[PDB]
Amino acid sequence: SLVIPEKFQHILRVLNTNIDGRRKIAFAITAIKGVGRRYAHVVLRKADIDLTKRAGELTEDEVERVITIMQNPRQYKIPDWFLNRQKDVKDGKYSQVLANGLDNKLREDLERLKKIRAHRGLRHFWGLRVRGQHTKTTGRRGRT
């Protein structure tokens, strides 16, 4: 129990990123780019895994079920308003992206804005603020 179990995996290699095993499973999975604190509790509530265990002693079948909940969260009855990427301009699907679709889709959206020549794209290309705030007094780390 409180004694370290056998084959206690220290470093977890999940989705070509580095994950510590010493952290709580509700917080060690938050180190993956794209997933945060709030959506982590839902995933470990759909899967029958308690929140009182560390990430370093879980095994292949439960972490494989959690990876299935990562990749296909829709048919495990996760509500549609809980997602980060909804109502796509390319195909119109509800999906959750985990750092690869997230990074390449953010890059594709930024080049889409730069190609479409909207002023949001021009401000992202120039390297300024887009949400419409004052630049006169702040943003002093822009350029030398």
Binding site: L2, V3, I4, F8, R22, R54, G56
Partner: protein, 77 residues
């Protein structure tokens, strides 16, 4: 001026368990802070070990609080 970044173990290895079971009930004041300092473990891990020792009956309760708890050894007589 040595840094010595502490890397506390998240669970007990072999030597920590019997070191605790032989030395912690032989100390005057027991709190999870001084257990984490002497035995280089985590704060919550010390709390779980102290709850186990309280359930075993080798430690008496003094006062409980949401900030810290106070534990002491048994009388040697």
């Amino acid at each position: 001026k040595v840094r010595d970044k502490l890397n506390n173990l998240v669970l007990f290895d072999k030597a920590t368990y019997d070191k605790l079971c032989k030395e912690v009930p032989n100390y005057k004041l027991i709190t999870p802070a001084v257990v984490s300092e002497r035995l280089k473990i985590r704060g919550s891990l010390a709390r779980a070990a102290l709850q186990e020792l309280l359930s075993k009956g080798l430690i008496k309760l003094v006062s409980k609080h949401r900030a810290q708890v106070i534990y002491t050894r048994n009388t040697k007589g």
